Amino acid sequence: SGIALSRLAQERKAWRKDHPFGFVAVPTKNPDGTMNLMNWECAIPGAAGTPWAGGLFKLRMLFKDDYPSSPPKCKFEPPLFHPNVYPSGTVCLSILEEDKDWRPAITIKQILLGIQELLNEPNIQDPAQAEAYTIYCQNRVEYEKRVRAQAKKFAP
């Protein structure tokens, strides 16, 4: 898709020029070695001063041919413990749904900052996985203990 590839080239240019510290966002490669702008490997650092601090959380960003009509699918690999992350790793976030709060103008930087914000502030109205949601509601101290252990597990 010329439209998608043009925009994704723009996003790549913008990202490389200016991005939040500690974040990674890089296109992958096709089997013939050429750049695949439709599939990006990303990393989100835990925010300092939070239970997520010290962790670096890898995710994949997958674009459809009609991007930016549609949002990318954003998938933590491996899946994370968090009330709004499905067991598959897919992130549940309103800006990542075409029929909700997605806008074509939203940038890869805004997506990754939006997901970082989600990590530290779950949306209890949108549970995506039973376990983390249940613990978040029943015992916040236990919830943070689990989050800190996970952050240590994914320390770079």
Rounded to 5°, the CA angle 146-150-152 comes to 120
Give the residue from 30, 55, 28, 32 showing the smallest Cα distance to 44: 55
Structure tokens at 89: 């790793």
Cβ-contact 101, 94 below 8 angstroms = yes
**Eight-class DSSP state of 91:** B
Beta-carbon contacts of 50 under 8 Å, excluding residues fewer than 6 positions away, are 120
48 alpha carbon, distance to own chain's centre: 17
Q: Does 113 bind ligand 5VJ (CB under 6 A)?
A: no
Interface region with ligand 5VJ, contact rule CB under 6 A, candidates 5-13, 39-47, 106-114, 125-133 = 39-47
Q: According to CB under 6 A, which one of 43, 47, 53, 106 is a site residue for ligand 5VJ? A: 43
Instruction: In angstroms, give the least distance from the CB of 2 to ligand 5VJ.
Output: 26
Instruction: In angstroms, give the least distance from the CB of 87 to ligand 5VJ.
Output: 17
Residue 42 known to be catalytic: no
Nearer to ligand 5VJ, 24 or 53 (CB): 24
Q: According to CB under 6 A, which one of 7, 19, 24, 70 is a site residue for ligand 5VJ? A: 24
| Contact residues for ligand 5VJ, defined by CB under 6 A | 24, 41-43, 58-60, 77
